[PDB]
Structure formats: structure tokens, C-alpha cells
Write a protein that binds this ligand. Structure first.
Ligand SMILES: NC(=O)C1=CN([C@@H]2O[C@H](COP(=O)(O)OP(=O)(O)OC[C@H]3O[C@@H](n4cnc5c(N)ncnc54)[C@H](O)[C@@H]3O)[C@@H](O)[C@H]2O)C=CC1
Ligand SMILES: NC(=O)C1=CN([C@@H]2O[C@H](COP(=O)(O)OP(=O)(O)OC[C@H]3O[C@@H](n4cnc5c(N)ncnc54)[C@H](O)[C@@H]3O)[C@@H](O)[C@H]2O)C=CC1
Ligand SMILES: Nc1ncnc2c1ncn2[C@@H]1O[C@H](COP(=O)(O)O)[C@@H](O)[C@H]1O
Ligand SMILES: Nc1ncnc2c1ncn2[C@@H]1O[C@H](COP(=O)(O)O)[C@@H](O)[C@H]1O
Lengths: 136, 125
């Protein structure tokens, strides 16, 4: 496939518009507090990192639902580590908004962390992708 | 690939609903069994009373922790529900979702389906 210049087609482009920052929680935070962080920052996702900066996993509103479905009130006390998804799929600065959609559709998740040089460098969400395919 | 009617022919006309007295905890149980992110709140008569998602679940537990699971779905749901029609387009949908900052738009004087941001996306590929 082949693309033109400044049509918001690449991950690098989306980052320039929205921002490079990522909100994170540590692994020993409880489920109930991860949810409180979701709400104060108005986001659907938080990346789980350790003392040293390693990505451990990813927790979203959808993990919240599964947790309470299965174990009710008690699950708010449990550590974010038992509900989070450990195998985290990523993209690169040069990934395209087309690939991204196919990853999100096929894998059935809505958040993709951006990597470069083994580093965490931002996060792209389905709502970013969608806005890009309109805003001009 | 581009009307609401087209999307419903591919995915289905059905909608998953709960009553208003169901607790937030049980609402959450329904979301998981059906693998969906939202559930439309209707009365004994069939009228749409609001919409409740995984996002309202987050706001509830953030504010009042374990006790919120006991509360009725009615105090956490969004009462003012925006909708689309059989002949709404893919484009318009995207702007409604982006501007309003939500991800589900019920199809309509009767309820006749529901469209989510994931549907719209898969249709554009
Ligand atoms: N009006 C706008 O500019 C935007 C509107 N939306 C709408 O908001 C609703 C919810 O959005 P979703 O994309 O489903 O995602 P979301 O609500 O999880 O994310 C919202 C924004 O926060 C960012 N974000 C998510 N997790 C983050 C983290 N850990 N650290 C830093 N930033 C993070 C995402 O990039 C996204 O731009 C949707 O209906 C969508 O259409 C989403 C993005 C932008
Ligand atoms: N493979 C496929 O055909 C689809 C894949 N997806 C992917 O799944 C993940 C979550 O999808 P979202 O679009 O955020 O929404 P969602 O998880 O709320 O929707 C999943 C499916 O359920 C439907 N749905 C939701 N609430 C319903 C209700 N009350 N009654 C009847 N049907 C209902 C939606 O139309 C969609 O087909 C995303 O990561 C997305 O990329 C989403 C839809 C279809
Ligand atoms: N990058 C990712 N890799 C694998 N699973 C993910 C990723 N992001 C989210 N998920 C999972 O997909 C499910 C629904 O995610 P979401 O659409 O991201 O709320 C949750 O279990 C998430 O943990
Ligand atoms: N079609 C809609 N019209 C109005 N509000 C909605 C609609 N869909 C969801 N909401 C609400 O907006 C927020 C985001 O929902 P969602 O992105 O669908 O998980 C939640 O507080 C919902 O109660």
C-alpha cells in the first residue's frame, strides 16, 4: 500500500496532534483505585509499570466489568495484577492507521501502546484513529 | 458499506436490555455474559429510559466504592440518550461519537437496533 503527506496516516502524526504522555499505575495498587485513576484522568486504560519502568500489562474498563462479574465487591480489594492483560500488543512510529484498525478489530481491543527502541513512547486509542479519519 | 441499515443487515437487529431496578452489580454481570459494553435501560412498557456502559461503571466505583454495586442502575445511567436512523451515514456517526464523547448510538418512534464504534470501524475496512 502507499500514502500521501500530512493526511494523518501514521502513528507519529497522531502523536503530534494529541500528545506523547502515558498515564500509568504500579502493580500493587488495587482494582478499585485503578478505576479511580481511570476517572480523574477521563481515560479508558492505564498501563501497569514496575519500579524500574518495565511494562507489566494493561488494565481497561473492560477488565473492570469482568472482575466484578466474577467476584463482586471483593474484587475491588484485589491487586490490579490479577485482572490485567500481561501480553501487551504494540505499534511503531511508522505504523499506519489502516494496520491499527485491523489489529484493533482482529484482537478485539481498543488500545495500542507505542514502542520505539524498546521504550514506551505513547498510546493510541480507537477514538484517535476515528477522529483522524475525519478532521480534514 | 455506508448506511446504518447496511450495518444492521451484517451484524443484527437485536438489542440487549435491562430493567431500571436491576442493580449496577447485576448490570455489570449482563455486560459480561453477552460480551458487550452497553445495555439499554427500558421500563415494563418498552420505553427507553437511559443507557448504561462500562464507563458509568468506572465513575460509580471511583465515587462510592463497594456500596455502588448495590445501587440501582437508574442513578448512574445517562437519561438523555442520542440516537440515529436507518438512513444515517457512517460519516455522520463518527462525528456524533467524537463530538459527544460516547461510543454507542441506539437506532430509532421505536428502538430497532444499536450501533457501536467497533461496527463503524470494521465497516471502513
Ligand atoms: N473529541 C476527541 O478529540 C476524542 C474523542 N474521543 C471519544 O471519547 C470516547 C472514549 O474514547 P476512546 O478512544 O474509546 O478512549 P479513551 O477514553 O480510553 O481515551 C481518551 C483519550 O485519552 C487517551 N488515553 C487513553 N489511555 C491513556 C493513557 N494511559 N495515558 C495517556 N493517554 C491515554 C487516548 O489517546 C484518547 O485520546 C469515544 O467515544 C471517542 O470517540 C476519543 C479520543 C479523542
Ligand atoms: N469483529 C467484529 O465484528 C467486531 C469487533 N469489535 C471490536 O471489539 C471491541 C469492543 O467493541 P466496541 O465497538 O467498543 O463496542 P462493544 O464491545 O459495546 O460492541 C461489541 C459488539 O456488540 C454490539 N453491542 C453492544 N452493546 C449491545 C447491546 N446492548 N445490544 C446488542 N448489541 C450490542 C456492538 O454492536 C458490537 O457488535 C473493540 O476493540 C472493537 O475493535 C467490535 C464490534 C464488532
Ligand atoms: N495492547 C493490548 N494488547 C492485548 N490486550 C489488550 C490491549 N489493550 C487492551 N487489551 C485488552 O482487551 C480487553 C478490552 O480492551 P479495551 O477495548 O482496550 O478496553 C481488555 O482485557 C484489555 O486488557
Ligand atoms: N448514545 C448515547 N447518547 C448519550 N449518552 C451516551 C450514549 N452512549 C453512551 N453514553 C454515555 O456516555 C458515556 C460514555 O459511554 P461509552 O463511550 O458508550 O462507553 C457514558 O456515561 C454513557 O452513559
Amino acid at each position: 500500500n502507499l500514502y500521501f503527506q500530512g493526511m494523518a496516516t501514521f502513528v507519529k502524526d497522531l502523536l503530534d496532534r494529541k500528545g506523547r504522555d502515558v498515564v500509568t499505575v504500579g502493580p500493587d495498587v488495587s482494582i478499585g483505585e485503578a478505576a479511580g485513576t481511570l476517572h480523574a484522568h477521563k481515560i479508558g486504560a492505564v498501563v501497569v509499570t514496575d519500579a524500574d519502568g518495565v511494562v507489566l500489562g494493561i488494565f481497561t474498563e473492560r477488565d473492570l466489568v469482568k472482575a466484578v462479574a466474577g467476584q463482586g465487591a471483593a474484587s475491588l480489594q484485589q491487586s490490579v495484577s490479577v485482572a490485567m492483560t500481561k501480553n501487551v500488543v504494540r505499534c511503531q512510529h511508522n505504523s499506519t492507521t489502516d494496520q491499527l484498525m485491523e489489529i484493533m478489530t482482529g484482537g478485539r481491543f481498543r488500545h495500542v501502546p507505542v514502542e520505539e527502541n524498546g521504550r514506551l513512547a505513547g498510546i493510541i486509542s480507537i477514538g484517535d484513529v476515528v477522529k483522524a479519519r475525519i478532521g480534514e
